[PDB]
Design a protein around this ligand. Structure first.
Ligand code: AMP
Length: 292
């Protein structure tokens, strides 16, 4: 298929919940791209919404470039920079073990990506390893964030008036990485993206979280069981056997007020000081770079 005149559709490379991703070629440029397609007649149109958020994000480091948006035949179309494997994919490729160095290289960039989104007046609300992708080629050392399907404005662009506190929210995103405040049904804010990152980092450290693979028939009972395990696992128990910085990070996130601006710089400096105490260099040599 020809798309937006200059793009050629190739084979599927990924299946989302709200769109499939296809390999493509920018025939004019001689460059591979990713093409996201959404059936025009989909019950729940989201691609046009996601594209608007990407436009507001554009020019960020580790934000995929949007090359073209249109409709074509029975599809809404978004053409974007082609990225590499997700951190979940690379975790599986690494036998579900990341070195401390890799976890800290990732933590540094992931805190910066979340800060960048927050600087653009959005919270992501689906912080999980599947939504962070390494670049390809020259961008291969760069962590990207994707899937702004669930993203939401947390403050007025103009006034910076924060969204109001709200309760009795149904659980938006993946329960495994959801904040305790999300489990309580509280409106998500900047703190919740960062608390989710904290669970992602301990997930990379452990290979799994203690509230993973809990048995339930129905879904709300599964979320209640995840909530109960999360709220009965002290941060010092979750983080036992790992550097204290992972616990300090999570304690900091749990202490944030609904409308607080997180101290992103403090959280990066926490991991940077540990990184330096270990004698690591920021040379972007990740575990997966050493697979032969
Ligand atoms: N720009 C991209 N480059 C490569 N793979 C992508 C890209 N965007 C999404 N994917 C993949 O497509 C799936 C999810 O698409 P999405 O609905 O955009 O989150 C996952 O398998 C992602 O790894």
């Amino acid at each position: 298929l020809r798309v937006g005149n200059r793009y050629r559709l190739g084979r599927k490379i990924g299946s989302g919940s709200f769109g499939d991703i296809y390999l493509g070629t920018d025939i004019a440029a001689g460059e591979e791209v990713a093409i996201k397609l959404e059936c025009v007649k989909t019950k729940h149109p989201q691609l046009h919404i996601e594209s608007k958020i990407y436009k507001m994000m554009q020019g960020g480091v580790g934000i995929p470039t949007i090359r073209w948006c249109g409709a074509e035949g029975d599809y809404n179309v978004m053409v974007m920079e082609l990225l590499g494997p997700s951190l979940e994919d690379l975790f599986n490729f690494c036998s579900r073990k990341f070195s401390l160095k890799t976890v800290l290289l990732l933590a540094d960039q992931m805190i910066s990506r979340i800060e960048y989104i927050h600087s653009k007046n959005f919270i992501h609300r689906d912080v999980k390893p599947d939504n962070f992708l390494m670049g390809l080629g020259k961008k291969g050392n760069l962590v990207y964030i994707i899937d702004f399907g669930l993203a939401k404005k947390y403050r007025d662009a103009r006034t910076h008036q924060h969204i109001p506190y709200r309760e009795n929210k149904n659980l938006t995103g993946t329960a495994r990485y959801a904040s305790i405040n999300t489990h309580l049904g509280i409106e998500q804010s900047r703190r919740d993206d960062l608390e989710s990152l904290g669970y992602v980092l301990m997930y990379f450290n452990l290979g799994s979280l203690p509230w993973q693979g809990l048995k339930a028939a129905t879904k709300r009972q599964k979320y209640e069981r995840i909530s109960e395990k999360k709220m009965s696992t002290p941060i010092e128990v979750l983080c036992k056997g790992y550097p204290s910085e992972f616990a300090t990070y999570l304690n900091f996130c749990r202490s944030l007020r609904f409308d607080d601006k997180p101290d992103y710089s403090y959280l990066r400096q926490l991991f940077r000081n540990l990184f330096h105490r270990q004698g690591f260099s920021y040379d972007y040599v990740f575990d997966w770079n050493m697979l032969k």
